[PDB]
């Protein structure tokens, strides 16, 4: 049970340029797509939102009843599909050799670590295991499942039916916005009818990146493309976009709320190499009132210069660098007999690394994180 100081900072931010090496997707029917040409031909959305229809006429809550919601049991809580795609990549594009990184994980999990210093009320629990000279990092399914139910219970005990329903519609409005702001294909290739709202569709980019001395593989969802996907697969990340929604800023409190949202959005995009974010601003009746395009690199200065402890993107990044370095130093890379858990506890404000002693290792190495298909492949090399 080792701990890391919450004031830990890396010497420099030590940045590296990320690059996508492969992608996979879950389509609108819950099926997974792994072919590289197919996924970019059929599972990519394209940004299209005329300034004409940003006049307060569009209700982001309209059609809430026809929301196609995936049951949260099946929402990639494991690493199965990621490892399926990674296996394919190593077989077909890495000459049958393992990808050359130290860490393999999801973008969202790293965002949690990166945003931690200014979100000390949010618990973090990550399973870490060493395999084939690499660290695999995932959230814990049973913990996530239990934490998800407890948070819903709290909401039900603290919210009226009206406010609870309002929350659900806020969630829906984000997916609604993505639907009305994107096209299945470029304009020229679309019908005029095109010119279900769901959370099934997920386009997952997988990038090689890093920080400091660490080389990392991050899998992260991408909302859409700003213009086009280049054919030679070069600098593809620079064409991706992120789509977000939030309430219009009509008070100081909401500006504070937005700055905290904008910071998490920056973290999300920065780790992934996403250079563009679009925020849709809605009123209480969910009508789309305004839109704003952000360059990811301009957000840290926006936050710092805001006339409202104080969120610092550079500080957060230095903390992130210290954490990654700590994990690679404290977890033996060649011991495959153990499993570890990194945990941040809000009530004690402690950041701990510990060896799991309940034989969680057995389940993690046989389904939840490592899969039989992936292990056999790595063994065969
Ligand atoms: C699985 O894989 C998907 C993507 O993983 P991630 O590592 O990209 O997750 P995160 O960065 O938290 O993305 C969140 C997305 O999960 C879902 C929806 O795409 C939601 O978008 P918002 O970030 O706008 O809420 C998620 O469903 C994750 O739970
Ligand atoms: Ca989004």
CA of 243 to the centre of ligand 2 (A): 4
Instruction: Please report where in the chains the tokens 């990038």 appear, as a residue.
Output: 207
Q: Which atom of ligand 1 is nearest to the CA of 111?
A: 11
In eight-state DSSP terms, residue 68 is B
Count the alpha carbons within 13 Å of 5 in the hemisphere toward its beta carbon.
6
Q: Where are the domains of the chain?
A: 1-381
Q: Give CA–CA dist 11/9, Å, rounded.
A: 7
Q: Is 343 in the pocket of ligand 1 (CB under 6 A)?
A: no
224-225 vs 240-247, strand pairing mode: antiparallel
Give the CA diameter of the chain.
Answer: 61
14: left (phi over 0), alpha (psi -120 to 50) or beta: left
C-alpha closest to that of 265 among 300, 309, 226: 300
Distance between CA atoms of residues 210 and 137, nearest Å: 15
Centre of ligand 2 to C-alpha 357, Å, is: 37
Tell me the C-alpha distance between 304 and 311, whole Å: 7
Reading the block at residue 182, the tokens are 């994107």
> How far, in Å, CA of 248 to CA of 254, rounded?
8
Q: Are strands 32-33 and 182-183 parallel, antiparallel or unpaired?
A: unpaired
- Tell me how far apart the terminal alpha carbons of the chain are, to the nearest angstrom: 35
Beta strand 124-131 pairing with 134-139? antiparallel
Q: How far apart are CA 304 and CA 301, in angstroms?
A: 5
Taking a 5 Å cut-off on Cβ, the residues next to ion ligand 2 are 223, 243
The response to whether residue 111 sits with its C-beta less than 6 Å from ligand 1 reads: yes
Structure token digits, residue 27 = 């389509």
Distance CA 128, CA 137 (A): 5
For 201, residues 6+ apart whose C-beta sits below 8 A from its C-beta are: 25, 26, 27, 28, 43, 45
Which pairing describes strands 350-355 and 182-183: parallel, antiparallel, or unpaired? unpaired
Q: Please, after which residues is the chain broken with C–N above 2.5 Å?
A: 195, 308
Could you tell me the CA-to-CA distances from 270 to 62, 101, 210, 275, 300 in Å, in that order?
32, 19, 12, 7, 10
Collapsing DSSP to helix, strand or coil, 261 comes out as helix
Report which of 226, 227, 228 is spatially closest to residue 293, judged by C-alpha positions: 226
Tokens for 223, please give them: 């909302």
Burial readout 342-369 (b: 16 or more C-beta within 10 A, e: otherwise):
bbbeeeeeebebeebeeebbebbbeebb
Resolution number, Å = 1.9
Structure obtained using:
X-ray
What is the C-alpha separation between 280 and 288, in angstroms, rounded?
7
Whole-number Å distance between alpha carbons of 181 and 54: 11
Nearest CA to ligand 1 atom 19: 221
94-99 contacts at long range (C-beta below 8 A, 24 or more positions apart):
96/381, 97/381, 98/132, 98/134, 98/378, 98/381, 99/21, 99/208, 99/217
| Residue 207 vs residues 16, 20, 231, 273, 369: alpha-carbon distances, Å | 12, 4, 17, 9, 19
Relative orientation angle of helices 161-180 and 141-158, to the nearest 10 degrees: 120
Check: CB of residue 91 under 8 Å from CB of residue 123.
Answer: no
Counting ligand 1 atoms within 8 A of each CB, the residue from 105, 108, 114, 141 with the most, and so the one to mutate, is 108
CA–CA separation, 22 and 149 (whole Å) = 34
| DSSP H helical ranges for the chain | 36-42, 80-92, 107-115, 141-158, 161-180, 252-272, 299-304, 313-330, 360-363, 372-380
Tokens at 151, concatenated: 């948070």
Region at 359 (left for phi over 0; alpha for psi -120 to 50; beta for the rest):
left
CA–CA distance, 116 with 6 (Å, rounded to integer): 9
Rounded Cα gap, residues 215 and 130, in angstroms? 15
Say if strands 224-225 and 202-211 run parallel, antiparallel, or are unpaired. unpaired
Residue 274: count other Cβ atoms within 10 Å of its Cβ: 25
For the chain, how many residues are written? 381
99 vs 86: CA distance, rounded Å: 8
SS3 category, 311: coil
Pairing of strands 202-211, 19-26: antiparallel
């Amino acid at each position: 049970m080792k701990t890391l100081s919450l004031q830990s900072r890396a010497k420099t931010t030590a940045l590296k340029q990320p690059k996508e090496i492969f992608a996979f997707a879950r389509d609108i029917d819950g099926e997974f797509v792994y072919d590289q040409k197919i996924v970019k031909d059929e599972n990519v959305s394209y940004y299209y939102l005329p300034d004409s229809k940003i006049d307060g006429s569009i209700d982001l809550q309209a059609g809430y009843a026809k929301f196609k919601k995936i049951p949260e049991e099946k929402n990639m809580s494991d690493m199965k599909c990621l490892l399926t795609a990674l296996t394919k990549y190593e077989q077909e594009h890495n000459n049958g050799e393992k990808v050359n990184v130290d860490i393999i994980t999801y973008r969202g999990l790293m965002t949690k670590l990166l945003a931690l210093p200014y979100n000390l009320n949010d618990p973090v629990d990550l399973n870490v295991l060493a395999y084939d000279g690499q660290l695999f990092i995932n959230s814990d399914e049973e913990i996530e499942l239990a934490r998800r139910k407890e948070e819903d219970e709290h909401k039900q005990q603290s919210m009226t039916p009206e406010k609870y329903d309002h929350m659900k519609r806020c969630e829906f409005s984000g997916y609604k916005f993505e639907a009305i702001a994107t096209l299945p294909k470029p304009w020229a290739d679309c019908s005029r009818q095109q010119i279900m709202v769901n959370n099934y569709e997920q386009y997952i980019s997988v990038i090689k990146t890093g920080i400091g001395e660490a080389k990392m593989l991050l899998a992260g969802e991408v909302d859409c493309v700003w213009d086009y996907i280049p054919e030679d697969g070069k600098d593809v990340l620079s064409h991706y976009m992120e789509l977000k929604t939030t309430r219009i800023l009509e008070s100081n409190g909401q500006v504070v709320n937005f700055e905290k949202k904008l910071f998490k959005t920056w973290a999300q995009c920065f780790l992934m190499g996403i250079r563009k974010v679009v925020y849709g601003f809605r009123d209480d009746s969910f009508f789309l009132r305004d839109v704003e395009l952000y360059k990811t690199e301009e957000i840290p200065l926006l936050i710092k210069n805001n006339a409202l402890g104080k969120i610092n993107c550079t500080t957060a990044l230095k903390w992130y660098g210290a954490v990654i370095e700590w994990l690679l130093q404290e977890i033996p890379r060649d011991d495959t007999s153990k499993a570890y858990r990194v945990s941040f506890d809000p009530s004690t404000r402690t950041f701990t690394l510990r060896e799991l002693m309940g034989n969680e290792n057995s389940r993690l190495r046989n389904g939840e994180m490592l899969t039989s298909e992936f292990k056999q492949w790595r063994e065969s090399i």
